[PDB]
Amino acid sequence: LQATPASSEKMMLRLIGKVKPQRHMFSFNNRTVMDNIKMTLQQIISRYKDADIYEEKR
Amino acid sequence: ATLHINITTASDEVAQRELQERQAEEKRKQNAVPEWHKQSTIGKTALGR
Amino acid sequence: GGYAWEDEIKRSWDLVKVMASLVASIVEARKKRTAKKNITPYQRGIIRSLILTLDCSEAMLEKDLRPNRHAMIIQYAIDFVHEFFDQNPISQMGIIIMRNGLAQLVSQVSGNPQDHIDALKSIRKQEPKGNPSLQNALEMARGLLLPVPAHCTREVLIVFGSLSTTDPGDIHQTIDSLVSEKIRVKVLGLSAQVAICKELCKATNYGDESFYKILLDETHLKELFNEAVTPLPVNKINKGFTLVKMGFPTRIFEDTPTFCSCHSKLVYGGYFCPNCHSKVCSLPTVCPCCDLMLILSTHLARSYHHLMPLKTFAEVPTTEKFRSEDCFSCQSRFPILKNHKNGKLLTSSRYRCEDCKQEFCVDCDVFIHEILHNCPGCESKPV
Amino acid sequence: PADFVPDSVSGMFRSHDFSYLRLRPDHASRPLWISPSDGRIILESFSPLAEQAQDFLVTIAEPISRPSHIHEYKITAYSLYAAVSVGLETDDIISVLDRLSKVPVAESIINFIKGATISYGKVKLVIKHNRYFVETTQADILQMLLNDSVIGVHSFEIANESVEVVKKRCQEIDYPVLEEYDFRNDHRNPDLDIDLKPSTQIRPYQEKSLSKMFGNGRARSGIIVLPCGAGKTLVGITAACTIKKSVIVLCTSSVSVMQWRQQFLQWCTLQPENCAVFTSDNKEMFQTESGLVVSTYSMVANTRNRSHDSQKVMDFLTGREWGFIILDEVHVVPAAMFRRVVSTIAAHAKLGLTATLVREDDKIGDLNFLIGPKLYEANWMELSQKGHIANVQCAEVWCPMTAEFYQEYLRETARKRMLLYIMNPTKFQACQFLIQYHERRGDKIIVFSDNVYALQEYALKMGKPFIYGSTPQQERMNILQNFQYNDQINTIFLSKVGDTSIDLPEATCLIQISSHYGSRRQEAQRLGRILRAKRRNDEGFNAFFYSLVSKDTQEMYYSTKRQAFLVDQGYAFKVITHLHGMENIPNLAYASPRERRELLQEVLLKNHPLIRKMY
Amino acid sequence: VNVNLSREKILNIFENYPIVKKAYTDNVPKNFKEPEFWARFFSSKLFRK
Ligand SMILES: [Zn+2]
Ligand SMILES: [Zn+2]
Ligand SMILES: [Zn+2]
Numbered sequence A: 001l002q003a004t005p006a007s008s009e010k011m012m013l014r015l016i017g018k019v020k021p022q023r024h025m026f027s028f029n030n031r032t033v034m035d036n037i038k039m040t041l042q043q044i045i046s047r048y049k050d051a052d053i054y055e056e057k058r
Numbered sequence B: 001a002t003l004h005i006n007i008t009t010a011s012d013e014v015a016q017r018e019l020q021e022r023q024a025e026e027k028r029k030q031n032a033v034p035e036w037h038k039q040s041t042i043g044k045t046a047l048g049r
Numbered sequence C: 001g002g003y004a005w006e007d008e009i010k011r012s013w014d015l016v017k018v019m020a021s022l023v024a025s026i027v028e029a030r031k032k033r034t035a036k037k038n039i040t041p042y043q044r045g046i047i048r049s050l051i052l053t054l055d056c057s058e059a060m061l062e063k064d065l066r067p068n069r070h071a072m073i074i075q076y077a078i079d080f081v082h083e084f085f086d087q088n089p090i091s092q093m094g095i096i097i098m099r100n101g102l103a104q105l106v107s108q109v110s111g112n113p114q115d116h117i118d119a120l121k122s123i124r125k126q127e128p129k130g131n132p133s134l135q136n137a138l139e140m141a142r143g144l145l146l147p148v149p150a151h152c153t154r155e156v157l158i159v160f161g162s163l164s165t166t167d168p169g170d171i172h173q174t175i176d177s178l179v180s181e182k183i184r185v186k187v188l189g190l191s192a193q194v195a196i197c198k199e200l201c202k203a204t205n206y207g208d209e210s211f212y213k214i215l216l217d218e219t220h221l222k223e224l225f226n227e228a229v230t231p232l233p234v235n236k237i238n239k240g241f242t243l244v245k246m247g248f249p250t251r252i253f254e255d256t257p258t259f260c261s262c263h264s265k266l267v268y269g270g271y272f273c274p275n276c277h278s279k280v281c282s283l284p285t286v287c288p289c290c291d292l293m294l295i296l297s298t299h300l301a302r303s304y305h306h307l308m309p310l311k312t313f314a315e316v317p318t319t320e321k322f323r324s325e326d327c328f329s330c331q332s333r334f335p336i337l338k339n340h341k342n343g344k345l346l347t348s349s350r351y352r353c354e355d356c357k358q359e360f361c362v363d364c365d366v367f368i369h370e371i372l373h374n375c376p377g378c379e380s381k382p383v
Numbered sequence D: 001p002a003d004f005v006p007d008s009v010s011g012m013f014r015s016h017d018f019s020y021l022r023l024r025p026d027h028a029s030r031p032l033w034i035s036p037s038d039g040r041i042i043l044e045s046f047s048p049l050a051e052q053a054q055d056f057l058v059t060i061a062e063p064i065s066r067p068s069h070i071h072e073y074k075i076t077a078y079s080l081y082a083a084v085s086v087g088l089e090t091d092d093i094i095s096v097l098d099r100l101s102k103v104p105v106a107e108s109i110i111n112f113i114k115g116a117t118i119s120y121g122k123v124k125l126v127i128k129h130n131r132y133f134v135e136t137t138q139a140d141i142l143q144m145l146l147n148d149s150v151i152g153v154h155s156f157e158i159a160n161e162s163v164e165v166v167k168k169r170c171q172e173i174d175y176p177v178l179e180e181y182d183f184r185n186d187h188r189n190p191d192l193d194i195d196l197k198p199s200t201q202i203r204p205y206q207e208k209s210l211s212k213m214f215g216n217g218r219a220r221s222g223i224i225v226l227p228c229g230a231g232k233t234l235v236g237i238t239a240a241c242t243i244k245k246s247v248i249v250l251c252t253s254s255v256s257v258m259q260w261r262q263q264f265l266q267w268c269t270l271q272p273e274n275c276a277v278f279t280s281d282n283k284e285m286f287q288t289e290s291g292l293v294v295s296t297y298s299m300v301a302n303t304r305n306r307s308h309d310s311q312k313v314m315d316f317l318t319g320r321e322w323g324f325i326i327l328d329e330v331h332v333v334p335a336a337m338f339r340r341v342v343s344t345i346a347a348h349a350k351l352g353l354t355a356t357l358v359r360e361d362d363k364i365g366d367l368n369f370l371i372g373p374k375l376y377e378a379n380w381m382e383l384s385q386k387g388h389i390a391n392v393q394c395a396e397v398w399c400p401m402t403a404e405f406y407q408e409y410l411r412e413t414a415r416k417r418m419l420l421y422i423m424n425p426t427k428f429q430a431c432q433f434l435i436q437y438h439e440r441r442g443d444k445i446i447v448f449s450d451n452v453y454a455l456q457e458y459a460l461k462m463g464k465p466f467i468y469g470s471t472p473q474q475e476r477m478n479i480l481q482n483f484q485y486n487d488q489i490n491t492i493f494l495s496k497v498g499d500t501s502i503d504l505p506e507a508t509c510l511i512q513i514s515s516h517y518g519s520r521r522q523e524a525q526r527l528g529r530i531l532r533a534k535r536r537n538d539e540g541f542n543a544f545f546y547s548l549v550s551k552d553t554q555e556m557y558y559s560t561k562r563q564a565f566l567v568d569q570g571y572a573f574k575v576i577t578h579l580h581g582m583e584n585i586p587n588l589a590y591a592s593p594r595e596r597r598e599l600l601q602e603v604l605l606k607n608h609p610l611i612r613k614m615y
Numbered sequence E: 001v002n003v004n005l006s007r008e009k010i011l012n013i014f015e016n017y018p019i020v021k022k023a024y025t026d027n028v029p030k031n032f033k034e035p036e037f038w039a040r041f042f043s044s045k046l047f048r049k
């Protein structure tokens, strides 16, 4: 997940997929919406990455 | 900030403690007395090229 | 409103202010001699099945004992195993540790001290950790002492280092089960008096609260470990007076190695079983071919001195006329013994025996109390 | 003597055979040996009743040396002056020394005790309305002074500049001057509400030093020496809080003035409106009736034409009767006009805080005349073993000089010889190897060299930052911040800037490439910059001190002279004539003979409003 | 931030807290995997309560 800092003007969230990798563009208007959506989506990809690591080890 | 958990089978974790022991060994090397300090260097040859 | 630095100087040099000192030592020695006057031929269980429970918890990492608690307990347990198998050869022993809330049996109940020494040496390398479980250790010892025969006394020695224990169940039911199985538990504690250990010792020892012992310093731990090698005196209510069948093997001599019946290895010497003609490596052990105890005369002889202990020698009166100027056992001259200027022969080092009335010095007195177990004067008497 | 028959083995003793003193029967408990020749006291620490004698000796005697087993003290006049001042009467000292010594106390030592202890407290220097008065309780003491008569109950006014001459002259006579401030009974000087914050804890050795200073309830002017980082500044704060009068503090650097102001406003309950700084940028003084002022020796003792504002501030300092002066780094007080700062300022109590109480000249013995008797010695081994300061491993690496370098060393003058023995390639190799080894261990390293050209050459050869006098201040701050935080910069090359009072990050390794002749003060100041490390709480931690010297040169002589002070503190400099890893290091600076020859030839190459426009 | 979850720790959580084991039975074989369930639980108000 590529996210934009608060110092930048345009708010946009880039998504990177796995196997050519799929790329998606998610632009937003408000900075609180970016903060909430990036922390929620970061938490869920952290959970999914931990699950994938545990499945790969087993 | 972000939260990560580790699901362990308690068999690798012992090895992880061994890894910590490795770091402890590094802590022994950081506090290790230099070889010229622990013993006398008089009988050895002089420093040079 | 003042300050500490504005006070007067401490003047600790000025605070320092500068015979019958042998009398001051000998009154303490007499108090030591008074505690030995309780000599009784109490019946003791010679054949013992001792279970040594050693703590291996986080409280074993405490450094009040040099250098850490866990290493000293292991070393003194090694010394205790050596002394116990030196003084109680017929008795068997197992070793259990409490680690991570679990009872780990590290050496099975056997009469060979070398296996227990190797097990303790192996445990010495590992680091103690966890919260100890008294109930798990007691249940493991109860399982270990179940096949012990009725003539062999069932004893457990718990070296408990921590102050609190976590059990998976009710420890009082375990205590009641141990009481019902005639298992006697002695607990040596390291920090303070734990109530559950005191209750367990009182219940297992028929109300005797003296079996819970707590050290004071290094030498007190040595003395407490050396106290446990003596067989515990049995109660009058115990009626397990059974004849025990054993044979005395003969040391076979052969220049050709043979397979032993116990380990199936090539050993030159051995001891052929008098019942089934099977050889063993060491004694005293059960015969692996017919389940018979195999002991020597010396193994029985090592535990006779508990059965007829000597009465402690009496301090001679100062005014009483001494029989000999020198010692009797080692003919050491008793000195002038003038503790102060007009002491004369005060607290004369002669120790009168209760039967032969012979005179022994303090060296002979402590030597008979430690190494010998028979009075030379009582044997020199032409009875 | 006591009719002792001289043995043939007493031939080479120059009248130091003390065998005539009969050994006591109960001697084994007594831990002392009193020498009648010079009052030197030999103490055994390993015996019982040693510390109960050690406190007695550190109250009545000055310790010459404190090794592990046998301690050596000196009975001197100034130690006895502080001994009687804190309440030890004459007969008590003789009785305790008689009780605590194997050999009997000789009559010469007893007579020395009586002579030094009596006739003390007769003459006293008091200050009344910024005017020095010497006062005596006995009348004829005024009439027996007819030689150094500087006159301008029984007391006469002396000049402010002549107080040092009076103190010297009265010390030559058997009437030493008593300099004690009864701040409890002093009401002319207005008090301060200065007090330590309750959150600040004071270490026991600091408490012992301040108990030496304030033993009798009166502030006694004197000198306190503590290691760098042991909290001498906190001792100054606590002394100011004890006296509770107006305080003037003198320092050597403006950054030291800033640090002292910061320490005052942090450890004690002093408002910033009571604090004033006399520096170039700041010259505003406190407007209250009492307070703290902090300044530098140079500005206070400036004989040059100072500015009008600084002149007004100096008039304010001189016209105000100060209750306390704190002279930081008192070893520079015996200088030419740094001596005069005790004369230009009328201060009742004078405390000199230092770490390096040595000078190469004898004027360091003039501080008892200027400030007062040496109140407290800190035992640097006792503080190191308790973790208060670092446990340094002092060492001296012997770098042999090469054949072509040593030939040029002998056919040269001393000034060029000084440059030439620094730049020997074996010292380059040793410094490079030590830097690499202690950087692999993860140590912050300071390399000291007083030669600026050598500092630059070593830093350029080894790719490390260098700080010297001509470096700009912002570049110095940037380099020090990179040294403190950036892990790629673990070695800094510092000139004599680092020897004096500048703020430095904590370092655990020091390599002394060169030095300023036989300066013991600079040696101990350099050692003091690794004595306050953060890793002292770590078990087995040791700091390192390397003095890289050229073998068979005059650098050996100066190195031994500099190390002569640290062996008095107890430090042992182990020689290192071999380094394991010399032959197997990847890159050796000046290993090839042609590179060494190029380095040698580089070192040898070193030595009417309208007419104004036309002009 | 990383936390290590041993299998014995999971069993102790189940024994001491039957509410967590009740949530384990109807979610882990049904919807999401066990580490995802534990990461959701550690960030929930139930763990704080
Ligand atoms: Zn065998
Ligand atoms: Zn058999
Ligand atoms: Zn005898």
Ligand SMILES: [Zn+2]
Pocket: C353, C354, C355, C356, C357, C358, C375, C376, C377, C378
């Ligand atoms: Zn007898």
